[PDB]
A and B are shown apart, each in its own frame.
Chain A
Amino acid sequence: PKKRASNGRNKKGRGHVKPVRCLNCARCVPKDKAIKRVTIRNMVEAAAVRDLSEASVYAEYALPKLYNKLHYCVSCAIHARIVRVRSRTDRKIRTPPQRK
């Protein structure tokens, strides 16, 4: 039967969408279907931000962040637990999970 009314992707009023390669396995996956995560991480772990600020020759030097956008295919993301299998009624919920 039909599993999703959206067919698991985001293509409406469109014929073709150029593919993207999975970060983990390099599989060609359409850009709208790929599980996309935007990550803004600190470049230095919180343990070393102290000794590195003390070792810095600059007074009031801000440590730069590491900006990255990750693309995963469905198998990679499910395997890496980026997304999980949800119940029939919970599939419809499309608000971002309340963690952040």
Chain B
Amino acid sequence: MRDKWRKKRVRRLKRKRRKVRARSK
């Protein structure tokens, strides 16, 4: 991959993890 999109893909995936973990505050 371009690696640029792979890091961005993880960034979109880190964002999802943070919001989901926030549900059970």
Give yes or no for direct A-B contact (beta carbon below 8 Å): no
Residues of A within 8 A of B (CB): none
